[PDB]
């Protein structure tokens, strides 16, 4: 692959997307979840006492560039998962770009959901104001300061399992074969450490289901999670029924549904009919949109697998365009 290019693997029905990263000298390959909703780079390690037998574990002893650190870390994600351990320093190779002396977080403990998942840890792509340890420079901060990228951007393509899966992240560039038309620039609010944007409105057919609302672009969240009122308005448009757990039951037959269209900075971006269905289990379909008790939306994979995004940490801003398909 080209310089800074990282092919991704689509896990299951567009649940999450991970890529290979080489850590250490001579180095081991790790599958990490690329997450724009967090900013810590943590990996399963041989110090871990409740990690999955299937995860690849970083071993300090096998890296001649490992450097010990006296600090500890602990993280607790919104979904109830967590992990904790110690800090360390080592080299990280991202698509051919060798970051020297990146702060890495070695897990000593991790939640069972991580132990049974497909990845070895997470690569945080949010802003450095939300690293759990103060003073930690993120991989993007280091790519920029070490001169590994000449533009402070990363282009993101997330595939659809229905079309074969895959995905691709490009550090320092983007690929126009993955999108159609012109990119639309959208200003980012990074005040909470996330890629926050304002959606002007959301429509289903001729109905305005929502007025402007704020949301965060999160590759690390599977669904499109909306504030209660907005989610109910959307559900009413499709005849979806509330499962009482943050999810909805929708008709498995999407041939009759109109796309969920977001108006962002004057252009239209949509969640295609096929994406309105997340998963089918014993003939019952779970919708691609859910609700949470937050005042802002979590714009997850349901939305990102339909729209290419160029993330610019420098401005900050994003450039978006409909996926070429
Ligand atoms: Ca996640």
From Swiss-Prot:
Catalytic activity, as annotated: Hydrolysis of proteins with broad specificity similar to that of pepsin A, preferring hydrophobic residues at P1 and P1'. Clots milk and activates trypsinogen. Does not cleave 4-Gln-|-His-5, but does cleave 10-His-|-Leu-11 and 12-Val-|-Glu-13 in B chain of insulin
Statement: the UniProt record of this protein carries the keyword Signal: yes
Species the sequence originates in: Rhizopus chinensis (Bread mold)
Record domain Peptidase A1: where: 17-321
Range of the intact protein held here: 69 to 392 of 393
Disulfide bonds: 48-51, 252-285
UniProt-recorded Gene Ontology molecular function terms: aspartic-type endopeptidase activity
Keyword Disulfide bond recorded: yes
Family affiliation: Belongs to the peptidase A1 family.
Active-site positions on this chain: 35, 218
Top-level lineage group: Eukaryota
GO biological process: proteolysis
Protein name in the entry: Rhizopuspepsin
Enzyme class: hydrolase
Keywords: Aspartyl protease, Disulfide bond, Hydrolase, Protease, Signal, Zymogen
EC number: 3.4.23.21
